Amino acid sequence: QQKLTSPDNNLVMTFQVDSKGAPTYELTYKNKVVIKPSTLGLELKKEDSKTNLYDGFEVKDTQTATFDETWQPVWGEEKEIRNHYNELAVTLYQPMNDRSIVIRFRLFNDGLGFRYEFPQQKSLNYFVIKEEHSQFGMNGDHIAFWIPGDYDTQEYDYTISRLSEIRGLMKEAITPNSSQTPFSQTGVQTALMMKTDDGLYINLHEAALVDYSCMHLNLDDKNMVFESWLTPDAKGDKGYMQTPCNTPWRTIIVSDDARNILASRITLNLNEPCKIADAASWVKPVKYIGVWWDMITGKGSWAYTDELTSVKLGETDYSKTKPNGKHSANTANVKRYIDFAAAHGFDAVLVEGWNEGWEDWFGNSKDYVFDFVTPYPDFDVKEIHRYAARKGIKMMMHHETSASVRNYERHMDKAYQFMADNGYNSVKSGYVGNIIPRGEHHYGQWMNNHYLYAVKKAADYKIMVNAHEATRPTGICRTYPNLIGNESARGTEYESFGGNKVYHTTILPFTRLVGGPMDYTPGIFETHCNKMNPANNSQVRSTIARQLALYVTMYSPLQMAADIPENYERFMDAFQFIKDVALDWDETNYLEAEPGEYITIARKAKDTDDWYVGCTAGENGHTSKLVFDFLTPGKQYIATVYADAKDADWKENPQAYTIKKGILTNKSKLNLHAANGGGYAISIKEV
Amino acid sequence: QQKLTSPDNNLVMTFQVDSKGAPTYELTYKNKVVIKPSTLGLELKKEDSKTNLYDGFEVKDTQTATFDETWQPVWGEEKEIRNHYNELAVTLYQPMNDRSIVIRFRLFNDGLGFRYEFPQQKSLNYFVIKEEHSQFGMNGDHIAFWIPGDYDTQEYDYTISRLSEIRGLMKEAITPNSSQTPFSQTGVQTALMMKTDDGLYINLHEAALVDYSCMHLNLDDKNMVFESWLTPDAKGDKGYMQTPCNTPWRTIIVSDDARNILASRITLNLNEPCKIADAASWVKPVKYIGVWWDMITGKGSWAYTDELTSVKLGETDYSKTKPNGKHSANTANVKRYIDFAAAHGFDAVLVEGWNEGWEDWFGNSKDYVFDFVTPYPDFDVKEIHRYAARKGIKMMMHHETSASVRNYERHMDKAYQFMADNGYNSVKSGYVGNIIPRGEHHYGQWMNNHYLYAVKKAADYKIMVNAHEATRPTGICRTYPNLIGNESARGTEYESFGGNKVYHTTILPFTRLVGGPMDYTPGIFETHCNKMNPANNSQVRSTIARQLALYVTMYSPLQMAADIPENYERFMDAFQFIKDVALDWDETNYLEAEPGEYITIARKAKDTDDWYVGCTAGENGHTSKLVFDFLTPGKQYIATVYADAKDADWKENPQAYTIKKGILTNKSKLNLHAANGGGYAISIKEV
Ligand SMILES: OC[C@H]1NC[C@H](O)[C@@H](O)[C@@H]1O
Ligand SMILES: OC[C@H]1NC[C@H](O)[C@@H](O)[C@@H]1O
Ligand SMILES: [Ca+2]
Ligand SMILES: [Ca+2]
């Protein structure tokens, strides 16, 4: 039996093979069982004994090591991250197939990562995975914060329930989406967050998802065991491998303090170091607005014309079509956004609907759907470039692919060259619809390769990428820091489609944000969508002060202010917080955190002595007793508090807020109350 | 009921809608039934009554027209082709679905073409084909010359049998291949050739296979009706369509003279005119030798080293590996081939195994299998280029993809740029293995798009393409004349893998060649492969003189002399015919033709007064009584006859030949005998 312990001696992992040679591990934290005895292994597709990569193993060799080094991300929640673990690598020989694998375990003070490694050898070269069988056996019927396991979307509201209740709730939890493939009545996605009856918080996830299919979890709800369930390709297979190769890491992050789940950097720590040598010279955080919410609410259109039943690029002559009078991506309107962005200190303006093809973009399984380079007649690329550059603004490129992936790859070098030629150095991509090639899913090994290919190629052009609908992140930004965002979860757009649950932003930082930032597009001040489009009666489940808080509580180096300029102009005093808030941080302090209920975070803006605080709360609101002892002794600060007014409420009174300005020091304390679906934001600037 | 008749009144096509509103057609030739009443229509994938595009139609309108214009191919069997037909277009309206299609019929003196057309309209825009239901009802249990219906290979020997015998022969007709998907016990490929008891020859095929899935034929052997059977995608669907759009043409070529099947230009006539405006300036025929037969026989290797269990491009350092002593694509060897090519008036030298990756090329479903640009340590790209240039020789590029198609697309512009930068202006591509993306077949709509994308992109680079394993041709060379070849049928390589049937080359011109030329790689003089590789006991099923004949009887603007130079050196007198024979023709006269038995053809070399003749024969040999009245009155010609010796035989005495030189005029006659698996060749040069 092998035993591995954390540097602080609080976690212990024990490993051994059972009497049939099945690799088995368990994990305790402060003498409490976190992972009951659980097996590890894979089943291979038949080309018989060779399909078995799950038992019949003997421990052939073991190697231990300790690692303790600090490194600096290009952008992040703090300036420096420490990577400190004890490691055990176990070489497992399978006599019946004359082949070996290695399982490598890295144990941190805040949890465990493991992966399988497949050395090059005479009897293991090319192989296909039928299923991975990594188990995570739970010690109780925990509370879980989960979304349905699905090969194609993550755009679901979270459910909070016991593990035993998942099966009963799955049908209701799967809401409609134009591309979705659930796989089990007890399947959930990663990162999965849980709260135990004996006071632990446990997060199950993976890190460094490269050259492999995305992992979901399937629950055996009799034994309370989660098991890896990979995403199949068009033929049902779960990964083409060639040695030497490795699986991604699988992680169990655990603490008796929920704040320490947010603090963990295990996911980043398990990714390969930055491979973009000059990254710091060109990768930069971006605060932006955009021509966007018009189309999301239905006020405006992405399409230039309504008169055609379909379009064929390079045949359809848009100069001969009638403008529909709703096309928001027109030069004059874009210039007005550039004006507002420059006036208020934003870095960029996104424009969607700029290019030919939007008439057919949705649900047609169309191959040649966009060319990514040809503008509509009312979008003057060169004039918009020149005007933005003169005003100090960068335009952000939009590459919706409509999930037509061969089409995007064929156009990608020309599309990136077009960006370089026209002053665009960041692009928001998207993959709406069922994947083409047809039969593949959004999160299979094939598409994972695509998303990273797009990122690696972008890096060669010094382009930053934010990909909507892509596989959810697993820390690869460490390796490729030009991946500055994904959506890859249910974002603010769904506040226009019926709403997100009130507690949504009190869960995302414990789940989605583990592995990388989200382009959540916060900042809606007019929360009634019917003021944009009288036919849309959706209401954003937030107060205005909570929207402000999200600039601190939804971490990202890429931050949109998503409302339209005229709405911000109606509340310019509150808007000041969005203008002031930083995007990049030297320190972060998690002040309060309870998943599904509240999150309060203070961050120190990079290369400054200034701090920003946000709190976001769920259905029951939250009372904070803040203590400002993280400020510098002897310094005075000008603090501006943006808070819910008394009786603010996301539903009945969302726009009621107060703003109070005064002096804070490290001796200050403030009592603040977040409303139902409310929150607060504080700027704290050194005098 | 509508009647359409050929210009010469010999053929009549009758069309009507039947009682249930199914469009049906029939065809007669000289008062003999060719096609019995047969239905037309398609079934669509469900998004109920909208799935029906096969009945419930009524005739809304008809238009007739006559077309009679001549055009000139860039390269071909003659200088000018006449396109002369009577047309009927029927507009068919479907009340229950409020939509219309058009079926267009073109009737020539030698057969019928039809296609379906789908106009843009309110109720037919995007749709997916479940099956096409084009019927061809036969009037009898004909003799057919067929290969098994298959979505992935055409590399089968032909079978000659009655239609009623196909079922019982299918199992034995399907021989092993690395990628094959047969679909029916009575499924066959097109072009399908038949001979009827009442003296007709009937060929069933398609033309202009663009943006659509390849058609095979499935035989109802109780009623003798063939029906279109399209190639499914990874999900089983049979084509994504968007109006306005058309199916390919379906063709019935018929005559009571088998020579007239060979003379038909229906397939080319039904393709769109040339879209490469400057094609005449850079597209040109190519006679070549190659570093190739070494590897096909096993004498030499494509791989550089035998040391590695697999390779990772960009990681494996070949300069640190041991040469295997068998790698034929080495500079010195390549220079000896260039020497031979230049000494004997060849245009080009193909080299295979020049680039990194060949250690892994076969059967591994490997994604990143080649980069198409990085040479092995022993292949000096620049020196070979300089040396070839000094000798007036062009190198022919090789792009085997190992069926990894995303990989080839991602590299394609870099690969074509590397060709341009290094003086390569033609490329032989290949698709050996099951297709990646996995789940697709070689002949589905998805891959058909790929092969044409490769050709269209090549045209932008002024590059000519010869693609092995691609979908078999349907006349698209007319539209893109830089498609100078495919294999896409069983070629000479199989003569090294056990042999082709003796009658193979007496069938190919009636089947495979209809739609475009084949890179058959004739010219094997040493027909016992065991002299290349003693472990290889394969024997080419040919005499030497029949190999000479193939330069005339297997038409192609791309002609290999496939043997190694040292073998040609042994038989240099016979090699003279290969040296002399032209590649491109002002006229072709089909002298004798019976499928499966013999084919004799005379052609006039373009821009000359010289003629070349070849005869290829089956198992029984063939006696020819040639009459040279196609020569010019009053001219004398120097004729050289390369013929089988009287005791020649493909098996027992293949290298026995005679060469006779003398004078011919248009009054001359020659009696010649082709041996079993033999033939003869004649050069006829004006004094
Ligand atoms: O690309 C169109 C639309 N697709 C979905 C993306 O999430 C949204 O932000 C974008 O506006
Ligand atoms: O590309 C390797 C090999 N594949 C099959 C092709 O038909 C053959 O000509 C070529 O030599
Ligand atoms: Ca989305
Ligand atoms: Ca081949």
Side-chain angles (χ1 to χ4, degrees), chain A residues 1-121 123-321 323-385 387-624 626-687, chain B residues 1-59 61-121 123-170 172-645 647-687:
Chain A
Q1 187 183 72
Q2 310 286 325
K3 180 187 180 165
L4 176 66
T5 55
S6 63
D8 73 5
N9 299 128
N10 284 143
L11 292 80
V12 180
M13 190 279 303
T14 58
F15 175 90
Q16 72 175 344
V17 298
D18 73 13
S19 63
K20 193 175 182 304
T24 306
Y25 80 109
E26 60 189 305
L27 181 71
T28 65
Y29 170 81
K30 299 196 188 312
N31 297 316
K32 294 174 170 176
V33 179
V34 177
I35 300 300
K36 298 187 72 168
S38 290
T39 53
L40 298 177
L42 300 92
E43 178 167 31
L44 312 186
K45 187 177 182 184
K46 200 161 50 171
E47 284 172 315
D48 102 283
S49 171
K50 287 175 76 171
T51 64
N52 178 335
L53 204 61
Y54 56 79
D55 69 22
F57 294 105
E58 64 198 29
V59 175
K60 173 192 194 86
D61 191 31
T62 69
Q63 291 280 357
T64 53
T66 296
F67 189 85
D68 189 6
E69 303 294 339
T70 66
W71 57 281
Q72 299 191 0
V74 178
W75 39 263
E77 297 188 70
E78 60 277 315
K79 186 181 189 209
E80 278 208 322
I81 295 180
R82 187 182 180 181
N83 188 4
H84 182 205
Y85 55 87
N86 295 323
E87 181 179 286
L88 165 66
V90 185
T91 301
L92 296 163
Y93 176 64
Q94 212 186 26
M96 73 179 189
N97 293 138
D98 192 27
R99 66 196 182 180
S100 297
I101 66 170
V102 170
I103 305 180
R104 191 171 309 274
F105 298 93
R106 296 187 175 167
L107 188 58
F108 304 82
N109 293 340
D110 49 345
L112 173 70
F114 62 84
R115 71 177 184 193
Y116 309 83
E117 308 180 357
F118 311 100
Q120 188 183 17
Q121 56 197 287
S123 301
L124 192 65
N125 288 107
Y126 290 88
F127 65 93
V128 175
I129 296 171
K130 170 182 168 179
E131 299 287 348
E132 184 184 322
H133 293 286
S134 301
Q135 294 189 342
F136 308 87
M138 302 290 96
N139 203 42
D141 188 11
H142 305 326
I143 290 176
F145 306 75
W146 59 272
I147 53 170
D150 195 297
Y151 300 153
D152 280 300
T153 191
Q154 318 97 338
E155 280 175 355
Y156 294 120
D157 269 312
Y158 278 87
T159 296
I160 303 178
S161 78
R162 296 284 173 174
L163 308 180
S164 55
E165 295 169 332
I166 294 178
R167 181 180 301 273
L169 287 162
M170 188 60 65
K171 191 176 150 62
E172 183 185 24
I174 300 161
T175 50
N177 191 287
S178 72
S179 182
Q180 57 187 158
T181 313
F183 60 84
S184 172
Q185 203 180 12
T186 57
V188 300
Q189 302 192 28
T190 269
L192 176 70
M193 180 77 200
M194 280 171 291
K195 175 187 175 161
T196 77
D197 283 3
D198 63 342
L200 306 184
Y201 294 88
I202 299 173
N203 180 292
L204 303 182
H205 193 32
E206 59 173 334
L209 174 60
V210 177
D211 292 330
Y212 207 78
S213 177
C214 188
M215 190 184 75
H216 304 100
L217 291 174
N218 191 42
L219 178 63
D220 166 356
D221 63 355
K222 205 266 272 234
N223 292 294
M224 301 307 170
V225 174
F226 288 104
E227 188 160 321
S228 59
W229 179 294
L230 307 184
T231 308
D233 72 7
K235 295 176 64 98
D237 301 320
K238 295 202 193 312
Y240 280 73
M241 298 296 120
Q242 177 197 169
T243 60
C245 55
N246 302 311
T247 67
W249 298 88
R250 283 71 187 83
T251 56
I252 301 128
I253 298 166
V254 57
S255 185
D256 53 18
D257 180 341
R259 295 173 295 186
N260 286 345
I261 304 296
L262 297 180
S264 180
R265 303 289 173 260
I266 287 175
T267 308
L268 292 167
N269 278 154
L270 294 172
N271 280 261
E272 296 297 329
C274 179
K275 286 182 193 302
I276 302 176
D278 66 346
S281 73
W282 62 272
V283 177
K284 303 170 195 310
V286 173
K287 190 186 293 174
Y288 70 115
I289 61 180
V291 177
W292 177 67
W293 190 238
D294 276 9
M295 297 85 67
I296 301 285
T297 60
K299 179 178 186 180
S301 62
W302 286 274
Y304 172 86
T305 187
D306 290 345
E307 82 186 9
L308 286 188
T309 62
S310 80
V311 301
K312 294 206 178 183
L313 297 179
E315 293 166 55
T316 300
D317 184 348
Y318 280 101
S319 80
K320 297 185 190 323
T321 64
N324 59 10
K326 298 169 292 182
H327 179 57
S328 304
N330 60 266
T331 298
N333 192 39
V334 178
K335 277 184 171 189
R336 293 193 287 270
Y337 281 72
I338 291 164
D339 288 340
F340 187 84
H344 302 293
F346 289 77
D347 303 300
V349 172
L350 167 70
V351 179
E352 308 197 345
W354 70 270
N355 53 316
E356 303 199 343
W358 279 90
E359 286 74 17
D360 288 3
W361 82 282
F362 192 83
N364 297 126
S365 196
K366 184 182 195 175
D367 190 8
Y368 185 33
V369 60
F370 294 111
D371 67 3
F372 308 91
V373 298
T374 304
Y376 277 134
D378 61 353
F379 188 93
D380 188 333
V381 177
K382 294 189 300 298
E383 172 66 14
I384 290 169
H385 179 192
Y387 192 79
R390 177 163 71 80
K391 299 302 189 155
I393 292 302
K394 293 302 290 198
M395 306 299 302
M396 190 160 199
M397 176 50 73
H398 188 222
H399 286 174
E400 172 62 65
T401 66
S402 291
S404 183
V405 181
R406 177 179 70 185
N407 183 67
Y408 188 36
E409 294 199 2
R410 286 185 174 175
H411 284 91
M412 194 180 289
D413 274 287
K414 287 288 182 60
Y416 286 166
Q417 189 62 53
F418 182 84
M419 287 177 64
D421 289 346
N422 292 97
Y424 299 81
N425 64 26
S426 63
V427 53
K428 171 179 179 186
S429 59
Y431 297 83
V432 175
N434 295 130
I435 299 291
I436 315 178
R438 307 182 180 91
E440 288 300 313
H441 298 289
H442 287 249
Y443 315 140
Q445 180 185 46
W446 190 257
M447 283 304 306
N448 291 343
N449 183 301
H450 177 260
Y451 306 124
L452 186 55
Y453 171 70
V455 165
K456 288 185 302 175
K457 190 190 294 292
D460 291 334
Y461 284 84
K462 290 183 196 188
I463 288 168
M464 292 179 295
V465 176
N466 166 30
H468 280 45
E469 293 84 43
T471 300
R472 56 96 182 80
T474 56
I476 295 163
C477 57
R478 176 180 188 184
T479 315
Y480 295 98
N482 67 316
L483 176 65
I484 60 168
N486 290 283
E487 184 173 65
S488 307
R490 189 180 178 95
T492 293
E493 58 174 339
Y494 279 86
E495 301 276 18
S496 176
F497 309 148
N500 295 341
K501 289 183 174 178
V502 177
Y503 57 44
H504 192 51
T505 54
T506 73
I507 296 172
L508 291 171
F510 289 100
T511 51
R512 171 57 183 73
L513 297 191
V514 186
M518 182 178 180
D519 179 42
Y520 185 72
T521 86
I524 303 297
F525 278 11
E526 291 279 4
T527 61
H528 288 263
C529 294
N530 61 19
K531 298 185 175 163
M532 289 287 290
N533 172 8
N536 179 347
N537 287 287
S538 194
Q539 182 173 354
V540 183
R541 304 213 165 86
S542 191
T543 71
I544 287 184
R546 197 255 279 290
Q547 292 294 291
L548 297 181
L550 302 182
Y551 294 86
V552 186
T553 69
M554 287 294 296
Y555 169 69
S556 175
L558 172 68
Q559 295 280 351
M560 206 181 182
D563 217 330
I564 62 169
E566 306 159 57
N567 287 339
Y568 287 131
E569 281 171 354
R570 187 170 299 103
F571 305 93
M572 288 297 281
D573 54 351
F575 192 55
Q576 188 69 39
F577 184 78
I578 301 184
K579 292 175 59 158
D580 289 349
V581 69
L583 306 171
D584 199 19
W585 311 102
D586 273 333
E587 299 181 36
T588 288
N589 189 325
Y590 304 96
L591 299 183
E592 306 179 282
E594 176 61 11
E597 295 284 348
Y598 54 85
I599 297 178
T600 306
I601 304 185
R603 309 184 187 269
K604 188 178 196 177
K606 187 168 281 177
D607 293 328
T608 79
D609 317 289
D610 302 339
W611 291 79
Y612 293 83
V613 182
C615 172
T616 177
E619 313 174 355
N620 305 125
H622 181 68
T623 296
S624 294
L626 293 184
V627 171
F628 296 94
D629 61 359
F630 56 87
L631 304 176
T632 309
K635 283 192 180 173
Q636 275 191 11
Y637 297 80
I638 292 165
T640 307
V641 176
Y642 307 76
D644 289 321
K646 171 84 186 183
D647 282 5
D649 182 74
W650 73 262
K651 189 173 181 176
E652 302 304 339
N653 194 25
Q655 305 182 314
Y657 59 90
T658 62
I659 303 176
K660 294 177 199 319
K661 185 178 182 196
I663 296 289
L664 285 183
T665 67
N666 75 332
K667 307 302 182 197
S668 302
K669 311 180 289 287
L670 287 175
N671 294 343
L672 295 169
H673 177 77
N676 291 8
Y680 54 80
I682 313 175
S683 55
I684 310 175
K685 304 190 104 157
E686 194 202 359
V687 167
Chain B
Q1 172 166 125
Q2 299 51 120
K3 257 98 168 41
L4 179 65
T5 64
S6 60
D8 71 3
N9 299 117
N10 289 326
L11 289 81
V12 178
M13 188 283 296
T14 310
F15 173 86
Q16 67 210 86
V17 172
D18 72 17
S19 60
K20 57 176 157 55
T24 77
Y25 79 110
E26 61 194 295
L27 177 78
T28 61
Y29 170 82
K30 301 197 200 310
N31 300 119
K32 287 179 175 159
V33 175
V34 179
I35 302 297
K36 294 187 64 176
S38 293
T39 52
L40 295 178
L42 317 218
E43 183 173 15
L44 311 188
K45 187 179 189 184
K46 196 193 156 69
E47 292 170 66
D48 282 337
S49 89
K50 292 175 166 166
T51 60
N52 180 332
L53 202 63
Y54 46 79
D55 66 29
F57 289 106
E58 54 193 32
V59 176
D61 191 28
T62 61
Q63 298 292 150
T64 54
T66 292
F67 188 87
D68 192 1
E69 300 297 332
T70 296
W71 59 279
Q72 295 192 2
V74 177
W75 41 262
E77 302 187 70
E78 57 273 319
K79 186 185 196 164
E80 207 159 53
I81 292 174
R82 187 179 179 186
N83 186 8
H84 181 205
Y85 55 86
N86 291 327
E87 185 177 283
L88 170 63
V90 70
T91 296
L92 295 169
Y93 173 66
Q94 214 181 27
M96 70 176 169
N97 287 142
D98 192 31
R99 67 195 184 179
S100 290
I101 70 175
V102 171
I103 304 183
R104 193 171 305 275
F105 296 97
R106 292 188 179 168
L107 187 58
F108 302 77
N109 292 343
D110 49 347
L112 176 66
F114 65 85
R115 73 173 181 195
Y116 310 80
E117 309 182 351
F118 310 103
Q120 189 180 47
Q121 57 194 285
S123 297
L124 191 65
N125 293 280
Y126 290 88
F127 66 95
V128 175
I129 295 166
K130 187 169 175 299
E131 297 288 347
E132 182 179 325
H133 294 297
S134 296
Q135 295 184 338
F136 311 84
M138 305 288 101
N139 200 48
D141 186 10
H142 306 325
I143 295 176
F145 305 79
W146 59 273
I147 54 168
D150 194 297
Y151 305 151
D152 281 294
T153 189
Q154 320 97 338
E155 288 181 348
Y156 296 118
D157 268 312
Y158 276 88
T159 296
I160 304 182
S161 78
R162 290 286 175 176
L163 302 188
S164 57
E165 289 163 343
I166 297 175
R167 187 180 292 279
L169 294 164
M170 186 61 66
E172 47 195 280
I174 300 164
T175 55
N177 189 286
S178 94
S179 182
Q180 54 188 341
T181 313
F183 63 84
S184 173
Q185 203 179 12
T186 52
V188 302
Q189 304 189 29
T190 83
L192 173 69
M193 187 64 201
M194 289 170 287
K195 180 180 185 182
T196 77
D197 280 8
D198 55 353
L200 304 182
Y201 293 91
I202 302 170
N203 182 293
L204 301 179
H205 196 204
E206 58 174 332
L209 178 54
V210 175
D211 291 326
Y212 205 79
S213 179
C214 189
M215 189 185 81
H216 309 285
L217 290 177
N218 193 43
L219 174 61
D220 165 354
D221 68 354
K222 281 166 181 317
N223 306 127
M224 302 306 177
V225 178
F226 285 107
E227 190 158 322
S228 58
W229 180 293
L230 310 183
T231 304
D233 75 4
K235 301 188 82 188
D237 299 320
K238 292 181 183 203
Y240 280 72
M241 310 292 284
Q242 183 197 344
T243 64
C245 56
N246 296 325
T247 72
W249 296 87
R250 283 71 186 81
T251 59
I252 300 110
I253 299 171
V254 55
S255 181
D256 56 19
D257 186 332
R259 300 168 305 188
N260 289 338
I261 304 298
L262 300 181
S264 181
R265 299 295 173 260
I266 288 180
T267 306
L268 292 164
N269 277 151
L270 296 175
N271 278 265
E272 300 300 312
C274 180
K275 289 182 186 302
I276 303 181
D278 71 342
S281 294
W282 60 271
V283 176
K284 48 226 324 152
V286 173
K287 194 185 288 178
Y288 72 112
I289 62 175
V291 181
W292 178 69
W293 191 237
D294 276 11
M295 298 84 71
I296 293 296
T297 58
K299 182 182 187 176
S301 64
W302 286 272
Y304 175 82
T305 183
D306 289 357
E307 300 201 305
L308 300 194
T309 64
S310 83
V311 312
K312 294 219 179 167
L313 299 168
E315 294 171 38
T316 297
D317 184 350
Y318 282 98
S319 70
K320 295 282 185 69
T321 69
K322 195 186 170 158
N324 57 18
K326 289 172 287 178
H327 179 52
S328 303
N330 62 264
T331 308
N333 194 38
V334 171
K335 286 185 167 174
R336 291 189 289 273
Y337 283 67
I338 289 160
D339 284 343
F340 188 80
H344 303 293
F346 287 79
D347 301 302
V349 170
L350 165 70
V351 178
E352 308 195 346
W354 70 273
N355 57 314
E356 292 193 353
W358 281 93
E359 291 69 23
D360 279 2
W361 80 280
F362 188 89
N364 295 132
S365 193
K366 184 183 191 174
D367 187 9
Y368 184 32
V369 55
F370 293 113
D371 69 3
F372 308 94
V373 297
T374 306
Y376 274 130
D378 62 349
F379 186 90
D380 185 338
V381 176
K382 294 192 179 65
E383 169 65 17
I384 289 172
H385 183 197
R386 301 187 297 259
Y387 193 83
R390 275 189 79 356
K391 293 269 184 159
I393 293 305
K394 280 292 186 181
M395 306 302 300
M396 190 169 189
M397 174 53 71
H398 189 222
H399 288 172
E400 168 67 62
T401 66
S402 285
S404 181
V405 182
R406 175 178 74 187
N407 181 67
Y408 186 35
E409 294 193 9
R410 284 181 172 177
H411 286 90
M412 196 180 288
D413 272 292
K414 285 169 183 88
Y416 284 171
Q417 191 63 53
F418 181 84
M419 282 175 68
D421 290 346
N422 292 283
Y424 292 88
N425 66 30
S426 64
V427 52
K428 164 184 201 285
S429 62
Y431 299 83
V432 170
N434 296 130
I435 297 294
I436 315 175
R438 312 178 174 96
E440 285 300 315
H441 298 292
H442 290 249
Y443 317 140
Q445 181 187 43
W446 187 257
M447 280 308 299
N448 290 342
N449 181 301
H450 173 259
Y451 303 125
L452 186 57
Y453 172 74
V455 164
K456 295 187 300 180
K457 185 187 297 294
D460 292 337
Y461 286 83
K462 314 302 189 193
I463 284 168
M464 292 183 286
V465 176
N466 167 30
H468 278 45
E469 296 82 40
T471 302
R472 58 91 181 84
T474 52
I476 300 164
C477 54
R478 177 184 188 179
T479 316
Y480 296 98
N482 65 314
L483 180 67
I484 59 170
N486 293 284
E487 184 172 67
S488 302
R490 192 177 175 98
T492 290
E493 59 169 342
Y494 276 88
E495 294 288 11
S496 176
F497 308 147
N500 292 338
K501 290 193 182 282
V502 176
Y503 57 44
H504 191 49
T505 58
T506 73
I507 298 176
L508 291 173
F510 284 101
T511 51
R512 170 59 178 74
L513 278 65
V514 186
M518 182 181 183
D519 181 41
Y520 186 71
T521 85
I524 300 298
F525 280 5
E526 178 48 66
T527 58
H528 299 86
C529 292
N530 57 19
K531 301 188 187 175
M532 293 282 296
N533 171 13
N536 183 341
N537 290 122
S538 192
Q539 184 174 350
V540 183
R541 302 212 174 91
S542 187
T543 66
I544 282 180
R546 193 255 281 288
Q547 292 293 293
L548 299 185
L550 300 184
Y551 292 88
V552 186
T553 69
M554 291 292 295
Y555 166 67
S556 178
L558 169 63
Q559 295 276 356
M560 203 181 186
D563 214 329
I564 57 172
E566 71 193 64
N567 287 338
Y568 288 133
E569 291 287 4
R570 295 170 63 202
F571 302 99
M572 284 299 305
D573 54 353
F575 191 59
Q576 188 72 36
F577 183 74
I578 304 188
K579 294 177 57 163
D580 288 344
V581 69
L583 302 170
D584 196 20
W585 311 103
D586 273 333
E587 302 188 37
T588 284
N589 286 13
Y590 303 93
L591 303 181
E592 311 178 277
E594 172 66 4
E597 295 291 340
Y598 51 89
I599 297 178
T600 307
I601 303 178
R603 314 179 186 270
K604 196 179 184 177
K606 179 164 295 302
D607 293 335
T608 83
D609 318 292
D610 304 334
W611 290 80
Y612 294 81
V613 181
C615 170
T616 173
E619 28 301 319
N620 307 310
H622 179 66
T623 299
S624 285
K625 291 185 180 45
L626 307 174
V627 173
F628 294 92
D629 60 0
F630 56 87
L631 304 177
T632 304
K635 304 299 169 190
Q636 286 205 333
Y637 297 79
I638 288 134
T640 311
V641 176
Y642 307 72
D644 288 322
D647 62 346
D649 177 80
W650 73 262
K651 193 180 185 168
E652 303 301 335
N653 192 26
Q655 302 176 325
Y657 61 89
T658 65
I659 303 182
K660 297 188 203 161
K661 186 172 182 191
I663 297 288
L664 289 178
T665 63
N666 81 330
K667 307 299 185 197
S668 304
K669 313 176 204 72
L670 290 179
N671 296 340
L672 297 173
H673 179 74
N676 295 357
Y680 55 76
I682 316 174
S683 58
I684 310 177
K685 298 195 158 208
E686 194 202 0
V687 159

